Amino acid sequence: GVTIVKPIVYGNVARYFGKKREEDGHTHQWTVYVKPYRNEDMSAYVKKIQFKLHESYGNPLRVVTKPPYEITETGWGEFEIIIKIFFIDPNERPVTLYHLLKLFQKTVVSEFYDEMIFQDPTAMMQQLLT
């Protein structure tokens, strides 16, 4: 058969404001992201990437259809974000990733390697993947 592996990295970077913002008490900017391990445009084969935030964010289900696949925000607390990658091929199962936002103990980075495996995809999707 044919196996196409698309290595990815996902997670988040964060920077402390310097002080706490008295307006809303946010302390950090963060960017949560998926990206290919090596430089490529994933919109070749990816329809969209949802980033599900804590539901006390406005518009908690964020959608990104064009690289970079990232959401930038501010806050004061760490919680799980769900990252769901949908493919242009409707017969390819979405990939669900789970990421604990890291804010605390210099840029803070929490990023994970993973691999989207396409086992025997349609020739058409194979064309999109390569």
Half-sphere exposure of 111 (CA within 13 A, CB side): 18
Question: In this complex, which beta carbon is closest to ligand ZHA, that of residue 79 or of residue 113?
Answer: 79
Q: How many Å apart are CA 49 and CA 23, to the nearest integer?
A: 31
Between residues 74 and 127, which has the closer beta carbon with respect to ligand ZHA?
74
Closest to ligand ZHA by CB, 56 vs 107, is 56
Angle at CA 9, nearest 5°, toward 7 and 14? 175
Residue 33 or 87: the one with the smaller Cβ distance to ligand ZHA is 33
Separation between Cα atoms, residue 43 and residue 18, nearest integer Å: 36
Least distance in angstroms from the C-beta of 111 to ligand ZHA: 20
Question: Binding of ligand ZHA at residue 16 (CB under 6 A)?
Answer: no
The tokens describing 84, both together, are 């769901």
Which secondary-structure segment (H or E) carries 124? helix 123-129
Binding mask 44-83 for ligand ZHA (x = CB under 6 A): ----------x-xxx----------------xxx-x----
Residues that bind ligand ZHA (CB under 6 A): 54, 56-58, 75-77, 79
